[PDB]
Design an enzyme around this catalytic site. Sequence first.
Site, PDB file in Angstrom:
ATOM      1  N   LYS A  21       9.932  30.992  13.187  1.00 41.11           N
ATOM      2  CA  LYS A  21      10.339  29.615  12.925  1.00 41.11           C
ATOM      3  C   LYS A  21      10.382  28.809  14.219  1.00 41.11           C
ATOM      4  O   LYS A  21      10.563  29.362  15.306  1.00 41.11           O
ATOM      5  CB  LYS A  21      11.692  29.632  12.205  1.00 41.11           C
ATOM      6  CG  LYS A  21      11.491  30.099  10.753  1.00 41.11           C
ATOM      7  CD  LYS A  21      12.817  30.378  10.041  1.00 41.11           C
ATOM      8  CE  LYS A  21      12.521  30.976   8.657  1.00 41.11           C
ATOM      9  NZ  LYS A  21      13.754  31.358   7.931  1.00 41.11           N
ATOM     10  N   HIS A  53      16.457  27.990  11.205  1.00 40.80           N
ATOM     11  CA  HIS A  53      16.122  26.840  12.041  1.00 40.80           C
ATOM     12  C   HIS A  53      17.369  26.307  12.729  1.00 40.80           C
ATOM     13  O   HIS A  53      17.296  25.862  13.880  1.00 40.80           O
ATOM     14  CB  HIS A  53      15.483  25.735  11.194  1.00 40.80           C
ATOM     15  CG  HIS A  53      14.174  26.145  10.574  1.00 40.80           C
ATOM     16  ND1 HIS A  53      13.966  26.562   9.255  1.00 40.80           N
ATOM     17  CD2 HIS A  53      12.982  26.157  11.229  1.00 40.80           C
ATOM     18  CE1 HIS A  53      12.650  26.792   9.143  1.00 40.80           C
ATOM     19  NE2 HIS A  53      12.042  26.564  10.316  1.00 40.80           N
ATOM     20  N   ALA A  54      18.523  26.406  12.065  1.00 38.37           N
ATOM     21  CA  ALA A  54      19.803  26.080  12.674  1.00 38.37           C
ATOM     22  C   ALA A  54      20.047  26.866  13.970  1.00 38.37           C
ATOM     23  O   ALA A  54      20.750  26.357  14.842  1.00 38.37           O
ATOM     24  CB  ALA A  54      20.940  26.329  11.677  1.00 38.37           C
ATOM     25  N   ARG A  78       7.417  26.582  10.706  1.00 35.14           N
ATOM     26  CA  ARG A  78       7.123  27.847  11.362  1.00 35.14           C
ATOM     27  C   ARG A  78       5.750  27.777  11.991  1.00 35.14           C
ATOM     28  O   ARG A  78       4.907  26.975  11.576  1.00 35.14           O
ATOM     29  CB  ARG A  78       7.348  29.028  10.400  1.00 35.14           C
ATOM     30  CG  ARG A  78       6.236  29.346   9.388  1.00 35.14           C
ATOM     31  CD  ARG A  78       6.776  30.464   8.483  1.00 35.14           C
ATOM     32  NE  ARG A  78       5.749  31.091   7.636  1.00 35.14           N
ATOM     33  CZ  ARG A  78       6.011  31.942   6.632  1.00 35.14           C
ATOM     34  NH1 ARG A  78       7.268  32.211   6.279  1.00 35.14           N
ATOM     35  NH2 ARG A  78       5.018  32.546   5.989  1.00 35.14           N
ATOM     36  N   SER A  94      12.396  23.366   7.087  1.00 32.21           N
ATOM     37  CA  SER A  94      13.774  23.842   7.117  1.00 32.21           C
ATOM     38  C   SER A  94      14.413  23.366   5.807  1.00 32.21           C
ATOM     39  O   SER A  94      13.986  22.343   5.262  1.00 32.21           O
ATOM     40  CB  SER A  94      14.476  23.237   8.338  1.00 32.21           C
ATOM     41  OG  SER A  94      15.875  23.202   8.191  1.00 32.21           O
ATOM     42  N   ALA A  96      17.993  22.981   5.721  1.00 29.21           N
ATOM     43  CA  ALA A  96      19.063  22.137   6.238  1.00 29.21           C
ATOM     44  C   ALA A  96      18.522  20.831   6.836  1.00 29.21           C
ATOM     45  O   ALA A  96      19.258  19.840   6.862  1.00 29.21           O
ATOM     46  CB  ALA A  96      19.876  22.899   7.287  1.00 29.21           C
TER      47      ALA A  96
END
Length: 125
Positions: A21, A53-54, A78, A94, A96
């Site tokens: 990612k 991703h966070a 990604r 993502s 989020a």
Amino acid sequence: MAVADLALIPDVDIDSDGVFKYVLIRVHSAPRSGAPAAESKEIVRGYKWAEYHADIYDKVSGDMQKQGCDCECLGGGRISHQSQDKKIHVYGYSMAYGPAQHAISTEKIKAKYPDYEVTWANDGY
């Protein structure tokens, strides 16, 4: 003390060896919380250790804010380079933060690795 500038920040930095990612992060002139500039810049980060991703957004914007810089992820995706065509590829999203502007990623990664080429298609996951 030191004070960064948006030109000094690595434009692309990644650790790539398969499918992993990445995030696109906008960065603004806030080094030392007192740099007189008010420009903005974008960076491409992505690593096999960021299983979500966070993870990269928290780590990287933590480092940016330790330099002083203020940030926002434009989204995530990604990076892969498998296929049967060695063109690096950028895609996905993502949950989020949604899909990034993979357009920015390809132009930057092409400039970082001019020996190769890079593409994107938001169709994938």
